[PDB]
Design a protein around this ligand. Structure first.
Ligand SMILES: CCCCCCCC/C=C/CCCCCCCC(=O)O[C@H](COC(=O)CCCCCCCCCCCCCCC)COP(=O)(O)OCCN
Ligand SMILES: CCCCCCCC/C=C/CCCCCCCC(=O)O[C@H](COC(=O)CCCCCCCCCCCCCCC)COP(=O)(O)OCCN
Ligand SMILES: CCCCCCCC/C=C/CCCCCCCC(=O)O[C@H](COC(=O)CCCCCCCCCCCCCCC)COP(=O)(O)OCCN
Ligand SMILES: CCCCCCCC/C=C\CCCCCCCC(=O)O[C@H](COC(=O)CCCCCCCCCCCCCCC)COP(=O)(O)OCCN
Ligand SMILES: CCCCCCCC/C=C\CCCCCCCC(=O)O[C@H](COC(=O)CCCCCCCCCCCCCCC)COP(=O)(O)OCCN
Ligand SMILES: CCCCCCCC/C=C\CCCCCCCC(=O)O[C@H](COC(=O)CCCCCCCCCCCCCCC)COP(=O)(O)OCCN
Ligand SMILES: CCCCCCCC/C=C\CCCCCCCC(=O)O[C@H](COC(=O)CCCCCCCCCCCCCCC)COP(=O)(O)OCCN
Ligand SMILES: CCCCCCCC/C=C\CCCCCCCC(=O)O[C@H](COC(=O)CCCCCCCCCCCCCCC)COP(=O)(O)OCCN
Ligand SMILES: CCCCCCCC/C=C\CCCCCCCC(=O)O[C@H](COC(=O)CCCCCCCCCCCCCCC)COP(=O)(O)OCCN
Ligand SMILES: N[C@@H](CC(=O)O)C(=O)O
Ligand SMILES: N[C@@H](CC(=O)O)C(=O)O
Ligand SMILES: N[C@@H](CC(=O)O)C(=O)O
Ligand SMILES: [Hg+2]
Ligand SMILES: [Hg+2]
Ligand SMILES: [Hg+2]
Ligand code: NA
Ligand code: NA
Ligand code: NA
Ligand code: NA
Ligand code: NA
Ligand code: NA
Ligand code: NA
Ligand code: NA
Ligand code: NA
Lengths: 419, 419, 419
């Protein structure tokens, strides 16, 4: 048990990258020599276990993180600064997923990965009428929506349960207040326990990434490298345009100098790049906000709220990844299930943890809400090749996630300081 | 967002009544001119959303309110006064639902509303033998009974869980006692959060009542007014006979003067009529009980327990409404599923909240336990016309609910004061 | 209600034994005279209710007791003594279920009870491949695994949830620590409430044992006495060999004298025999460990942990009972579903309560994890005759359960005292 401690205390990012490179080389070598069935028999279950462990964690996170998230965005406890930062956060997340859809429309990520995983194509499901679609957001049974997949009734019930808990917590009864407090504390404990299971699965993640993309290279060939490079280029160009366009325009409007802002926020942005965590970058972010002249009463509230709510990079990555997974199956996302991406990726970026590798878990919610279930072997085959390169996108994802919080704190402090 | 605050702070009862009258006039006018399909296309989803929001709240209330209700009726914490008021409360609720069945037998509410909502009638389900019916009260899986509809296993598991929690809370172990305390507090927090969601849905309720009974008048015609007047007459004659017969006989037996009792309890009865809430009428009820000479050690315990347990008017309304919904489909309730109404409406009146509009939610439990599921379009069509006039019956419902508590406090204080 | 208090305060073991003897005599007498259908109509539902009440309690116990059990075996809070006693406990439970399989292989319990309960035999289910079997331990939805039967995903999710809770409880955040504390306290409250429901069902248990084995004797005949005597002999010879072989060899290795150990532990072993409870024998066990010279810092930690984790007799009884139930249906347990017994009976002995009659509830988990569901009428008929004689096996079961704790405390104190 010495080698186990040698394996655990190694850096996780350098473990996943040398799992990825070794998986690519071993998969291409074994696929050139005709051993594409040996990898499917022996190596592929170790990646199937990784995909299964990531898909286990979806529904408790979607319930509990959205309960404790709507408990902080609730209008019963939201002041005057809080309404401004909530409006900023939701509008920037919606523009992030819109820019991700645009950048996944300019590039064509996945067109060329025509998937016939059992000899069959992917048949899209027929949609109900819009009245029945809007009426099935309200469940007839919330326990039945939790026991089945049904993420869209679960989101609605979680949001209204959190808002009702916050309306309970400022009651005039002591028993009612204590009961609402311990219910919210139990749901928050479940939400933190699932994040610990995410942190535990991300230690197994190098072997899973190896076993996934070795089979991807041996089965699907060599052009998947050139097709995943298009996804990486689309995500990084989308994040660069997100930062430049959105944050530089919103800082030039409110009189902030963006160049000095970036030169002040560099120490938080590089830490969010190399650590891939917004929760571990929060002391550096608060120190950077202290060094920018922002008063303590602003960034002592806007930054810990923004570390779990405002994730622009996760919403952009989920838009680009949903378009990639839909293009790999040959489907064409119609208008109407393309606005569902805009709503559901904002809700997923709210529900995302803030630990390394948590956006690929909430991508399953956006895939389920459109009509691409991961029980289908074609969707589960297209999800593996976007799960394999998640550690490359997670760094820029977390960097833009932290930069959005710093931009919102600067803008709202500039608006508040006029008095 | 000024008009939203104009809409919210308006009185809710005067909102629902002017939604109801406008819905009746607009539905009759648009149904006379042949526009019965335009209302079904455009107005009816706004009432379907209201029925769906009320049917969402059934199973968490049925679980949690019955857990925290059986935690207060439990024989591990019930003293000598408590056994007497529990016996009084259960016997008066059983006589209330029996009198509701009698008053819905004398009048014929719903005979004339022959429903053919899809060209088909309502086919009653074939019952199993009585041994299997009694054996399916105990579930093989309580989570499976919660995930499906299955209200009768859920009631049994909730009652025995509350009794086991109360037997845990007087243990000799500190850890066991603290764990039982926080489990009961979390379940009570869920039970209060669902009541807050009820209070939130009852603000949308004017638009829902409008959209429901406009389609009811346009589709089914003009004689539905004369058929709902029979239901209103049956409910109010049943409540008058409940008060007069049951409470005046039980007060004449125990030496109380009923005329002076009514003249003392008028200030609580009128408040329960106009506010439609037993929880908001509790300070007035305790003040009225203080003005009747009742000692503090009696009404400080019997009245807050009676505000959530003893609901005679809700049980009578649920009996009359179940007979109306069964008569509207053409079915005839056999003996055996007519005693199931007597048991299940008592359990529903225990599980009812005490907020305005909470008996129509627990009517779904009595409808499910008989064999009338609300997934059937005929039952969902017959439930809408009894949901539309709920604010007319809720006032007398709450009045009799408060009068039963005051009668029980007077009777048990008269029995205790002989020592 | 005087006769109810006469019935309750009677000793439960002497109630179950005189229910058993009367059931055997009445069943044989009524089966000799051809009245085997009258007992099936009138007496058999009172035993079906007992089996249903015991099968209700399976899934909440399997979830909550394993969460709070893995929260105590967790490596985040396990010291140096704790690793040694955990290794001892798990290895002794595995050897206990292995010895139970051996003793149920030497004897042939159930061969001669060929069951054709509806004219049909028992058809064994076809197993999936080993990769899919190992991959279905991780659920795609934990709420879906709880709502269905699915005990093997529930065990995995419960264990990792408990380990994540213990990794949360030593965090640096106050809110996270308090939330993990109240979540673990709520789950522990549920786990204690289900044990109170077990203690309540075991008061009805004499009538259930009567109604079960009266129908067993009237239906299946007189040779079932000779076939249950083989199960009793196999269990008691297995427990004697468990004590003698395992504990006397493990005490002779570490320099302890086993004869003086038994002469010191007699006062705890007889109390565990006659009371059938490891939780009620814990003060006597700690007093016996104090009288053996063991230091307070060892037995103040190893014995309350061993009272809920180390159950060798329950694992041996579950191995012998699973082989008996498989032999009664005519099936032959293959290798692979015979190692599943070794894993699952260890997990069931961890999850067992420590109250009288709790191993027959967790036997359902071992039956479900092999491929013998209790919804099948043949398995439900073979489970009743092993449920009828549970009070005979429970005494020696609890005796070996307490003796294992005392042996582990002595061995680990001898290992620690060398410093
Ligand atoms: C070749 C092997 C292939 C088969 C291996 C199958 C492994 C199945 C995977 C199971 C993942 C389940 C994760 C458990 C979740 C609960 C644990 C947990 O929450 O604690 C977490 C503990 O994390 C873990 O270490 C869990 C272990 C995950 C698997 C690690 C081993 C990989 C597989 C074995 C290969 C290496 C073995 C040694 C060989 C060199 C918290 O960790 P943290 O981020 O460092 O936080 C610091 C604490 N203050
Ligand atoms: C024409 C519009 C048709 C489409 C409208 C669809 C609306 C969908 C309905 C959603 C109902 C969901 C209710 C959320 C439950 C959680 C909220 C909650 O618990 O707090 C409750 C807040 O209640 C609410 O206001 C929730 C809002 C419900 C809908 C109100 C608006 C009706 C629809 C819009 C029409 C009016 C808009 C303005 C036009 C004049 C507590 O309220 P309280 O009783 O006053 O307690 C006092 C606090 N101390
Ligand atoms: C001939 C009768 C056949 C039909 C009878 C059907 C009975 C259905 C069985 C229901 C069992 C449900 C158990 C409720 C679980 C919750 C109660 C609970 O947790 O408290 C437990 C209370 O236990 C009970 O007494 C529950 C009653 C169980 C049934 C007892 C009556 C047997 C059936 C009636 C026959 C005897 C009636 C009188 C005739 C002589 C704790 O008891 P403890 O072990 O003494 O602990 C001491 C407290 N510090
Ligand atoms: C649509 C999203 C609307 C969220 C609230 C925005 C409406 C403005 C508002 O909050 O009204 C305030 C009170 O209104 C409320 O809080 C009730 C609104 C709660 C949300 C109701 C609808 C929830 C629907 C779930 C969201 C959609 C889920 C989609 C799932 C796919 C009045 O302002 P105040 O006097 O300062 O606060 C009184 C408490 N002390
Ligand atoms: C944010 C605004 C959400 C827009 C809701 C529109 C919508 O639900 O689209 C529907 C898509 O349905 C879905 O994606 C699943 C449920 C969507 C709920 C949206 C909330 C129908 O669009 P379609 O299937 O493409 O029909 C062909 C004509 N375009
Ligand atoms: C049938 C309803 C029976 C409810 C309890 C009435 C039996 C009299 C009784 O409580 O016995 C007392 C103890 O007995 C118990 O508490 C156990 C009874 C708990 C309920 C057992 C059966 C529950 C069945 C659920 C109700 C039916 C649900 C129907 C769902 C469709 C003895 O009096 P005590 O010495 O003052 O209290 C000892 C504790 N310190
Ligand atoms: C309070 C006493 C409950 C009485 C239980 C009788 C019962 O369960 O009725 C049964 C009705 O079944 C139901 O309503 C659903 C489950 C009832 C459980 C009652 C507790 C059979 O009556 P039927 O279908 O009308 O058969 C025709 C002959 N009448
Ligand atoms: C396979 C069972 C492995 C259980 C843990 C044994 C691995 C050794 C170990 O605990 O590593 C320690 C940390 O590792 C962990 O705690 C993570 C392991 C948690 C369990 C991960 C796998 C759980 C799988 C569930 C069990 C199987 C369920 C089967 C269901 C049919 C390192 O020692 P330390 O520095 O003293 O502790 C650091 C915290 N302060
Ligand atoms: C403790 C080590 C567990 C060993 C796992 C082996 C296993 O899962 O067996 C499998 C049995 O499957 C089961 O019993 C249900 C799930 C077992 C999961 C074991 C963890 C296949 O064996 P088989 O059906 O007898 O196939 C015929 C060839 N023997
Ligand atoms: N790693 C990201 C979350 C994600 O997108 O998965 C963050 O901490 O911000
Ligand atoms: N409004 C009633 C409850 C109901 O019958 O819905 C009360 O408070 O008493
Ligand atoms: N009665 C046993 C548990 C069991 O095997 O059922 C004990 O307390 O140890
Ligand atoms: Hg996933
Ligand atoms: Hg309803
Ligand atoms: Hg059982
Ligand atoms: Na944003
Ligand atoms: Na987030
Ligand atoms: Na952020
Ligand atoms: Na009553
Ligand atoms: Na009530
Ligand atoms: Na009342
Ligand atoms: Na053991
Ligand atoms: Na145990
Ligand atoms: Na033990």
């Amino acid at each position: 048990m010495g080698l186990y401690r040698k394996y655990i205390e190694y850096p996780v990012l350098q473990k996943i990258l040398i799992g990825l490179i070794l998986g690519a080389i071993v998969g291409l070598i074994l696929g050139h020599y005709g051993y594409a069935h040996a990898v499917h028999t022996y190596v592929k279950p170790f990646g199937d276990l990784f995909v299964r462990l990531l898909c286990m964690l979806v529904m408790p996170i979607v319930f509990a993180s959205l309960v404790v998230g709507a408990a902080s965005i609730s209008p019963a406890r939201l002041g005057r600064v809080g309404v401004k930062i909530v409006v900023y956060y939701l509008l920037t997340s919606a523009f992030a997923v819109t820019l991700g859809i645009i950048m996944a429309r300019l590039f064509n990520p996945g067109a060329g990965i025509h998937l016939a995983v059992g000899g069959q194509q992917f048949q899209p499901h027929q949609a109900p009428p819009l009245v029945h679609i809007l009426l099935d957001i309200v469940p007839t049974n919330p326990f039945g929506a939790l026991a089945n997949g049904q993420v869209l009734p679960t989101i609605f019930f979680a949001i209204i349960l959190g808002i009702a808990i916050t309306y309970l917590m400022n009651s005039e009864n002591e028993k009612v207040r204590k009961s609402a407090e311990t219910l919210l504390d139990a749901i928050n404990g479940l939400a933190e326990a699932m994040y610990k299971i995410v942190n535990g699965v991300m230690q197994y993640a190098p072997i899973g990434v190896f076993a996934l993309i070795a089979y991807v290279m041996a089965e699907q060939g060599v052009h998947v490298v050139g097709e995943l490079a298009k996804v990486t280029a689309a995500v990084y160009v989308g994040l660069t345009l997100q930062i430049l366009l959105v944050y530089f325009v919103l800082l030039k409007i409110y009189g902030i100098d963006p160049i000095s802002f970036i030169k002040h926020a560099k120490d938080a942005m590089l830490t969010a790049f190399v650590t891939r965590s917004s929760s571990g970058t929060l002391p550096v972010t608060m120190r950077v906000a202290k060094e920018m002249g922002i008063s303590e009463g602003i960034y002592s509230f806007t930054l810990p709220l923004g570390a779990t709510i405002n994730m622009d990079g996760t919403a952009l990555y989920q838009g680009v990844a949903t378009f990639f997974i839909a293009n790999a199956l040959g489907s064409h996302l119609t208008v109407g299930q393309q606005l569902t991406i805009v709503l559901t990726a904002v809700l997923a970026s709210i529900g995302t943890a803030g630990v390394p590798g948590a956006g690929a878990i909430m991508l399953c919610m956006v895939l389920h809400s459109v009509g691409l279930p991961l029980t289908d072997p074609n969707v589960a085959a297209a999800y593996a090749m976007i799960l394999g390169i998640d550690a490359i996108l997670d760094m820029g994802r977390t960097m833009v996630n932290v930069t959005g919080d710093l931009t919102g704190t600067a803008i709202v402090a500039k608006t508040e300081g006029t008095l």
